[PDB]
C-alpha cells in the first residue's frame, strides 16, 4: 500500500509542479514585458 | 479448536488491516493534495 | 457487517472530500484573484 | 446534515467574498486615483 | 424482551445522533464563519 | 431529560457565539482601522 | 459568570484599543512631521 | 436516606462548579489580557 | 477542605499572574524599544 | 519474536524515510527553482 | 524462582530498551535532517 | 520554588536584553555610519 | 497504625514533590533560556 | 531508590541540556552569520 | 545512544552549513556582480 500511495502522491506533486510552472512563466513574462516596455519607451523618447 | 479460532481471528485482522489501509490511503491522498494545491497556488502566483 | 460498514464509511469520506474540494477551489480562486488584481493594478499604473 | 452544513458554509463564503471584493475595489480605486493624480499633476506642470 | 430493548436503545441512539449533529453543525458553522471573516477582512484590506 | 439538556446546551452555545461575535467585531474593526490609518496617512503624504 | 467575564473582557479590550490609538497617533504624527519637514525644506530651498 | 444523600451531593457539586467557574474566569481573563497586550503593543508600534 | 484548597489555589494563581505580568512587561518593553530605536534611527538619518 | 518484529519495523521505517526523502527533494527543488527564477528574472531585467 | 523470573524480566526489558533506542535514534535523525534541509535550503537561497 | 524560578528567569532575560542592546547598538552605528558617509561624500563632491 | 502510615505517606509525597519541583525548575529554565536566546538573537540582528 | 532515580534523571537532563545548547549555538551562529553577510554585502555595495 | 545521536546530528548540521554557505556565496557573488556591472557601466558612460 505504501508503494502505491507514495508513487501516486509523487506523480500528483509532479503534475502540480507542471501547472504551477506554466502559470508562473505566463505571469513573469507578462510583468517583465510591461516593465521593459515602460523602461524602453520612457528612456528612448 | 484453538487452531481454527486463532487462524480465523488472524484472517479477520488481516482483512480489517486491508480495509483500514485503503481508507487511510484515500484520506491521506486527499489531505496532501489539498495542502499541496494551496501551497503551490499561493506561492507561484 | 464489516464489509458494509467500511464501504459506507469510504463512500461518505469520498463525498466529504468532494464538497471540501469544491469549497477550497472557490476560496482559493477568490483569494488569488484579489491578490492578482491588487498586484497588477498597483504595478501597471 | 452534511449537505445543508456544507451548502450553507459555501453560501456564507460566497457572500463574504462579495463584500470583500466590493471593499477592495473601493480601496484600490482610491489609492490608484491619488497616485495617478500626484503623478500627472507633478509631471504635467 | 431483547427485541424491544435493543430496538429502543437503537432509536434513542439515533435521536442522540440527531441532536449532536445539529449542535456540531451550529458550532462548526460559527467557528468557520469567524475564521473566514478574520481572514478575508485582514487580507482584503 | 436529554431534550432539555441538549436544548439548554444549544441555547448557551448560541449566546456564547453572540458574545464572541460582538467582541471579534470590535477587535477586527479596531485593528483594520489602525492599519488603514497608517497606510493612508503614510502614502498620501 | 459568562456575562461578567465577557463584559470585563470587552471593557479591557476597549481600554487597550484606547492606549494603542493614542500611541500610534503620536508615532504617526512624529513620522509624518519629519517626512514633511524634509520634503518641504529640501524642495523649497 | 437517598433523598438527603442526593440533595447534599448535588449541592456540593453546585458549589464546586461555582468555585471552578470563578477560578477559570480569573485565569482566562489573565491569559487573554496578556495575549491582547502583546498583540496590540506589537502591531500598533 | 474544599474552601481552603480552592482559596489557596486561587491565591497561587494570582501570584503567578503577577510574576508573569512583570516578566512580559519587561520583555515587551525591551522588544518595542529596540524596534523603535531601529525605525527612528533608520528613517531620521 | 521481538527480534523479527523490531527488525521488520526498522526496515519499514527505513524504506519510508527513503520515499519521504525522494518526495521532499523533488518538492524543495521545485520551490527553490521557482523562487530563484522569479528573483533572477526580476532583478536582472 | 523469583530470582530467575525478575532477572530474566529485567534482561528482556533492557534488550527492548536497546531496540527502542536504536529505532528512535534512526527516526529522530531522519526527521531532524529533513527539517534542517528544508530550513537551510529555504533561507540560504 | 516559584519565587526563585521567576527571579532567575527575569535576571536571565535582563542579561539577554543587555547583550542584544549592545549588539544592535554596534550594528546600527555601523549601518548609519556607512549610509551617512555615502550620502555626504556623494552630495558634497 | 493509620497515624504512622498516613504520616509517612505524606512525608514521602512531600519529598517527591520537592525533587519534582527541582527537576521541572531546571527543565523550564533551560527551555525558556534557549527560546529567549533564539528570539533575541534573531530579532536584534 | 527515589534518591538515586531522581539524581540520575536530573544528571541526564543536565547533560541533554548541554548537548542541546551546543547544537543551537552552532545553528544560530550559522544562520545569523549568513543573514549578516547577505545584509552587509547587499547594502555596502 | 545520546552521545552518538547528538554527535551525528551535529556533524550533519555542520555539513549542511557548509553546502548552504557555498551556495549563498555563489548567489551573492552573482547578484553583487550584476549590480556592480550595471552601476559602473551606467555611470561611467
Author numbering:
A (entry chain A), B (entry chain A), C (entry chain A), D (entry chain A), E (entry chain A), F (entry chain A), ...: 6 to 50
Task: Copy text from the publication.
Using helical reconstruction and applying C5 symmetry, a 3.2 Å-resolution map of the fd phage capsid was obtained, which allowed derivation of an atomic model of the capsid. In agreement with previous predictions, the atomic model reveals a pentameric (C5) subunit arrangement of the pVIII capsid protein, which forms a single α-helix containing 50 residues. The helix is terminated at the N-terminus of the mature protein by a proline residue (P6), and residues 1–5 of the capsid protein, which are located on the phage surface, are disordered. Due to helical symmetry, capsid protein monomers stack almost vertically to form a highly symmetrical arrangement along the helical axis. The C-terminus of the capsid protein, which faces the inner lumen of the cylindrical phage, interacting with the genomic DNA, has four positively charged lysine residues exposed to the lumen. These lysines presumably bind to the negatively-charged DNA phosphates, as also seen in other phages. While density for the DNA is observed in our fd cryo-EM map, it is not well-resolved and does not support atomic model building of the DNA genome. Our structure suggests that while Y21 is involved in hydrophobic interactions within the capsid, it does not act as a structural hinge, evidenced by our high-resolution map. Structural comparison with Pf44, a class II inoviral bacteriophage with a prophage lifestyle, shows a slightly larger capsid size (fd: 50 residues, Pf4: 46 residues) and lumen diameter (fd: 24 Å, Pf4: 22 Å). In agreement with previous work, our structural model for fd suggests a circular single-stranded arrangement, as the higher positive charge-density of the capsid protein (four basic residues in fd versus two in Pf4) suggests that twice as many negative charges of the DNA phosphate backbone are being stabilised.
